[PDB]
Amino acid sequence: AERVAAFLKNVWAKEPVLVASFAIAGLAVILPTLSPYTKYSLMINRATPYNYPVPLRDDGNMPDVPSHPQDPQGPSLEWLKRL
């Protein structure tokens, strides 16, 4: 804890450019795993509709599939409007 602290002070005095590089690279590797917002990047990427949403033939037993886009079934982007 101290010998490492005495090590950091030496590199901070001698090679501040390298200390900053390694510090930033560590944060780039670590912070994504800690951030609570990282999960939203996945959802937003999946919510972007690049191609046509081909409708399903209705066989009479799909109560979770909306019949109309303005029906209440299917994924909602209310979470995204607030974000």
Partner: protein, 114 residues
């Protein structure tokens, strides 16, 4: 090999929706909601059949719904709509976000009148 069977030139005739892309963009959101049922039936046909010759009749109904949809706008909200798509048309990218004042007028007109 066989002869590629094609429909007749007259079997392909239908009234065309001859409005520009900015007009379609301005009406796109209401058009999607209003004409969904015939539109989805046509797209289901195209993806199941994988043949444009097999869904021509479904494609004629898509046109008819679009025409009746634009005839309703013309009857009731011709002026707010004209101001709105004319604002879309100015933009080189046809951006929605530059025309929110005019969109609100058009949106408020269709809600009251239709």
């Amino acid at each position: 090999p066989g002869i590629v069977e094609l429909p007749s030139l007259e079997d392909l005739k239908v009234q065309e929706v001859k409005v520009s892309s900015s007009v379609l963009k301005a009406a796109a959101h209401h058009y999607g909601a209003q004409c969904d049922k015939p539109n989805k039936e046509f797209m289901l046909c195209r993806w199941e059949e994988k043949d444009p010759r097999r869904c021509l009749e479904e494609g004629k109904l898509v046109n008819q719904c679009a025409l009746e949809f634009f005839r309703q706008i013309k009857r009731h909200c011709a002026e707010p709509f004209t101001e709105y798509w004319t604002c879309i048309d100015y933009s080189g990218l046809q951006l929605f976000r530059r025309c929110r004042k005019q969109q609100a007028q058009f949106d408020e007109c269709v809600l009251d009148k239709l």
